[PDB]
Design a protein around this ligand. Structure first.
Ligand code: JPP
Length: 324
């Protein structure tokens, strides 16, 4: 009566262990969810605690689809709109990207992973609006998944936010999610705008979602997220032959003494396929790779590719386009 698919569980375990060994990393996790039910199809960690559920991290760039979705859902932003994406200051803090683009449209913000552009979309809303949105995604909220030691994550009350915090939260710092919570939040994108519960028991009754965005918004965001895995995108390593994949890469500096350091990273990669009508969500995080690169695309992308490609094959889903 578990929902886990043992063939997916095996595949995820093998691919994760190979990536952690190759990159000489400290730890990692893979989660596979059913994109329309929230059932856990696989959940694996490197040896030790169930980090997928016990440990909260700053999501970094994999948070970006959500402020984007909210902006579009509000009707205040259109996908074709352009934004000033030059680095800027809020008090003494800087908001900047790893490459300077003077301007980007929404597709650009997503494809290139612009911290600046994301922060400009968030800035159109009040602290209370953005908090309510993050809360509605499950940030800071207990899933009651069935696992012991389940982290609620952290979402600071909006009454306490400084202007810099609203900005950094939009691109994934100053709030914290477990990987399972993060995979759950992506059900808003895959299940036509409603957040699903997560469970590791086979479902007998249709889960009731909570409406977070319109189905039309969800569909538009999934189309934008295909750019991440196509040429020009940060997540091209996660492309799966025969499918369109919606995804988002994240690489985050870690905190050492409450200071961000530039020699220690967490790499995350999350996506879904087939992009137009997804069957599965695959989420991958690898903590502190020390060899053979540290960016999401190079560290977690190949794991995502193998697990997603393998999962769709195991579940009997045909390629939507010819192989190559
Ligand atoms: C997404 O994850 C994004 N990553 C970064 O911008 C990342 N930035 C940070 O770690 N920080 C630390 C925290 N603060 C203060 C709150 C920041 O402003 C901040 O930006 C980073 C990581 C490594 C090197 C440079 C910057 C961009 N998306 C990833 C990705 O893999 O998609 C890029 C590497 C393309 S940048």
């Amino acid at each position: 009566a578990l929902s886990l698919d043992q063939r997916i569980q095996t595949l995820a375990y093998e691919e994760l262990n190979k990536a952690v060994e190759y990159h000489q990393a400290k730890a990692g996790t893979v989660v596979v969810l059913d994109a329309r039910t929230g059932e856990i199809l696989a959940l694996v960690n490197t040896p030790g605690r169930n980090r997928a559920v016990t440990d909260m991290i700053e999501p970094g760039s994999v948070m970006k689809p959500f402020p984007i979705a909210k902006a579009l859902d509000s009707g205040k932003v259109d996908t074709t709109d352009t934004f000033n994406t030059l680095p800027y200051k809020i008090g003494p803090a800087t908001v900047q990207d790893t490459h300077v683009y003077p301007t980007l449209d929404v597709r650009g913000i997503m494809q290139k992973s612009s911290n600046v552009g994301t922060s400009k979309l968030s800035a159109m809303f009040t602290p209370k609006e953005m908090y309510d949105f993050y809360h509605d995604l499950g940030v800071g909220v207990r899933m009651h998944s069935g696992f012991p030691g389940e982290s609620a994550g952290v979402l600071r009350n909006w009454r306490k936010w400084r202007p810099i915090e609203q900005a950094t939260m939009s691109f994934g710092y100053g709030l914290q999610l477990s990987l399972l919570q993060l995979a759950r939040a992506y059900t808003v994108l895959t299940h036509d705008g409603e957040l699903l519960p997560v469970s590791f028991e086979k479902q007998a009754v249709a889960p009731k979602g909570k409406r977070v965005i319109k189905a039309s918004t969800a569909k538009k965001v999934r189309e934008l997220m295909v750019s991440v895995t196509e040429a020009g995108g940060s997540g091209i390593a996660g492309a799966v032959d025969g499918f369109d994949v919606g995804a988002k890469t994240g690489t985050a500096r870690k905190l050492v003494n409450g200071r961000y350091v530039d020699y220690k990273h967490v790499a995350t990669f999350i996506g879904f396929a087939p992009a137009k009508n997804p069957r599965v969500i695959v989420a991958v995080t690898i903590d502190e790779p020390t060899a053979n690169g540290y960016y999401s695309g190079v560290v977690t992308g190949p794991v995502f590719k193998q697990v997603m490609g393998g999962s769709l094959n195991i579940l009997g889903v045909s390629p939507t386009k010819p192989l190559t």
